[PDB]
A paper describes a structure:
Proteins attached to the surface of group A and group B streptococcal human pathogens that contain tandemly arrayed Rib domains have been associated with invasive infections and proposed as potential vaccine candidates. Here, we study Rib domains from Rib, R28, and from a surface protein from Lactobacillus acidophilus. Together, these 5 structures of homologous Rib domains, and further sequence analyses, show Rib is an example of domain atrophy, a rare event in domain structural evolution involving the loss of core secondary structure elements, and also reveal the remarkable structural malleability of this domain family. The structure, molecular dynamics simulations, and small angle X-ray scattering of a Rib domain pair suggest tandemly arrayed domains are likely to form an elongated rod on the bacterial cell surface, thus suggesting a possible mechanism of immune evasion mediated through domain number variation.
We hypothesized that some members of the Rib domain that have long insertions in the position of the characteristic Rib D-E strand atrophy may retain the full Ig fold and thus represent something akin to the ancestral form of the atrophied Rib domain. Thus, we solved the structure of “Rib Long” (RibL) (residues 1165 to 1268) and “Rib Standard” (RibS) (residues 1269 to 1329) at resolutions of 1.07 Å and 1.25 Å, respectively. As predicted, the Ig-fold D/E strands missing from RibR and R28N are also missing from RibS but are present in the RibL structure. Thus, RibL comprises a full Ig-like fold which likely represents the ancestral state of the Rib domain, and RibS is an example of evolutionarily recent domain atrophy from RibL; this is remarkable because there are very few cases where we have the structure of both atrophied and nonatrophied domains that are closely related in sequence. RibS belongs to the “Rib” subfamily, giving a Cα rmsd value of 0.6 Å for superposition with both RibR and RibR28N, versus a Cα rmsd of 2.3 Å for RibL. A longer Rib domain contains the full Ig fold and likely represents an ancestral preatrophy structure, thus providing a rare example of a closely related pair of structures of an atrophied domain with its ancestral form. In the atrophy of the Ig-like RibL, a significant loss of the structure (∼20% compared to RibR/RibS) is involved, but the domains remain thermostable with melting temperatures (Tms) of 78 °C and 88 °C for RibL and RibS, respectively, and 71 °C for RibR. As Rib (RibR, R28N, and RibS), RibL, and aRib form 3 distinct Rib subfamilies, this begins to shed light on the evolutionary pathway of a fold where an ancestral Ig-like fold (RibL) has lost core secondary structures (RibR) and diversified in structure (aRib).
Author numbering: 1163 to 1268
Amino acid sequence: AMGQTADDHNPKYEDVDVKPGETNKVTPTNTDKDGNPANIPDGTKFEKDPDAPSWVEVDPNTGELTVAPPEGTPSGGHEIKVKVTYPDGSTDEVPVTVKVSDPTTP
């Protein structure tokens, strides 16, 4: 079998909308080359882009995203990246859209 594990997986994160002082958690979903749900391979590792906000964290083993903007964080949108490394050393860059909403009043 030729190719890379990355060719057979398509991790995805739902959009995040979070107010200052909230904590939201997002589990990546995943589909195969045919578009059908599939589990991410065990041993896959996850790392946020080092330029991502300090208040976005990515579980290194599971890829779960914890988004916890402090009080005082400005409202606004962010387009961030998570690097996925499969156990064969292949990689994917996976985006997440993170909106910080106003604390009280949209």
